[PDB]
């Protein structure tokens, strides 16, 4: 049986996800976290501001 081998990355991700896949599908979640966290600044398109508060002491 064959492990993963780096030098062909399109091949590596294949024969990682097919022979020792159980860390692949973890790290797919690990890349779905922050990369999708960077594809939101257009995707919220200024959706909402939460607007919470402690006590509003006002001005003169």
């Amino acid at each position: 049986a064959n492990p993963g081998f780096w030098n062909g990355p399109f091949r590596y991700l294949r024969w990682s996800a097919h022979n020792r896949p159980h860390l692949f599908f973890a790290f797919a979640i690990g890349i779905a976290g922050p990369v999708a966290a960077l594809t939101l600044t257009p995707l919220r398109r200024k959706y909402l501001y939460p607007d919470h508060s402690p006590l509003p002491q006002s001005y003169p």
Binding site: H22, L23, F25, A26, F27, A28, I29, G30, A32, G33, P34, A36, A37, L40, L43, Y47, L48, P50, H52
Partner: protein
């Protein structure tokens, strides 16, 4: 002062009488699952076997010259006191609105489920047998390694909650049926839940006669019924704890009881009924859960310690750290965070 002590006696007799008939229940359902019939003979119908077995196995009481009685006469009482019973101090959704618990829920249950582990370890420490205590260290090692991924997942499901008192999870979860419908890692919680309270398909330190014709120590007598009752009571507690947070209490027919109680009662006749159906909801969410424990008792065989540590520290835990690389991420993405 009198009402709360009769409260606490009702709740203790519920849990004790419950865990008494639970062993008869599981043996019956194994038996029908094993194409036979369970205890069908005891006394009056056949619902009574454990309730006679408790009186049976009191009256044995041996001691062993290889070990101080002072530890093994108390260490199965230790996990009987702390692991079984005062886990119910949190009143793990004592199924109404009300509880017998003030507040600050989930990490108390964490602390006591954590506290049971050296109750197992010091139990296995006994008798100074060079083949025994290595099996004890095996048991406790796999026990803590799945304690960790109970812990690190029910702290991430409360990231949809952020409030640490007991009820606020439950009032939060009634909108979505939040528990499993938004996330199916319930199942890995379930497969974590068989390990941290080992009534398992793992059976791992119960190498019953692979050792010198004894598995744990064979501390038979009152410590035996203590260990037995505390294991089953830890099972129904952690099963309730599953039905507490990551499986839901407060079934949606009580949400629809706005369209039912307004068609049934006029105005607040001593709150006579709603706590009962709420208890019915939580009970049917709890026993249907442990029916799967009694499945997995008799479906898949023991699980091979080296592969068990493989199953902890290699697969489930990195999937887990991915899964709370996204549940902070995805709610931050989609709209926003929860308040408290």
């Amino acid at each position: 002062m009198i009402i709360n002590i009769v409260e606490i006696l009702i709740f203790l007799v519920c849990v004790l009488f419950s865990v008494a008939y639970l062993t008869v229940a599981e043996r019956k359902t194994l038996a029908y699952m094993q194409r036979r019939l369970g205890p069908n003979f005891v006394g009056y119908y056949g619902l009574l076997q454990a309730f006679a077995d408790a009186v049976k196995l009191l009256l044995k009481e041996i001691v062993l010259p290889k070990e101080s009685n002072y530890i093994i006469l108390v260490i199965s009482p230790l996990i009987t006191l702390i692991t079984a019973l005062i886990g119910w101090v949190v009143i793990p959704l004592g199924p109404g609105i009300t509880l017998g618990e003030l507040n600050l829920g989930i990490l108390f249950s964490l602390a006591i489920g954590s506290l049971g582990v050296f109750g197992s370890l010091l139990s296995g420490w006994s008798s100074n047998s060079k083949y025994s205590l290595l099996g004890s260290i095996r048991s406790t090692a796999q026990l803590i390694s799945y304690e960790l991924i109970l812990t690190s997942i029910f702290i991430i499901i409360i990231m949809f909650v952020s409030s640490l008192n007991i009820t606020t999870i439950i009032e939060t979860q009634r909108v979505v049926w939040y528990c499993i419908p938004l996330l199916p890692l319930l199942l890995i919680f379930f497969i974590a839940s068989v390990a941290e309270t080992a009534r398992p398909p793992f059976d791992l330190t119960e190498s019953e006669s692979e050792l010198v014709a004894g598995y744990f120590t064979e501390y038979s007598g009152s410590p035996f019924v203590f260990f037995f009752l505390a294991e089953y009571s830890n099972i129904i507690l952690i099963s309730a704890f599953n039905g507490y947070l990551l499986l839901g209490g407060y079934l949606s027919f009580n949400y629809s009881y706005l369209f039912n109680i307004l068609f049934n009662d006029y105005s607040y006749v001593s709150f006579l009924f709603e706590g009962l159906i709420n208890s019915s909801a939580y009970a049917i969410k709890l026993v249907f859960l442990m029916f799967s424990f009694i499945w997995v008792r008799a479906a898949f065989p023991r699980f091979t310690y080296d592969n068990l540590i493989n199953f902890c520290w290699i697969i489930l835990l990195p999937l887990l750290f991915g899964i709370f690389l996204i549940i902070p991420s995805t709610l931050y993405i989609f709209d926003s965070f929860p308040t408290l």
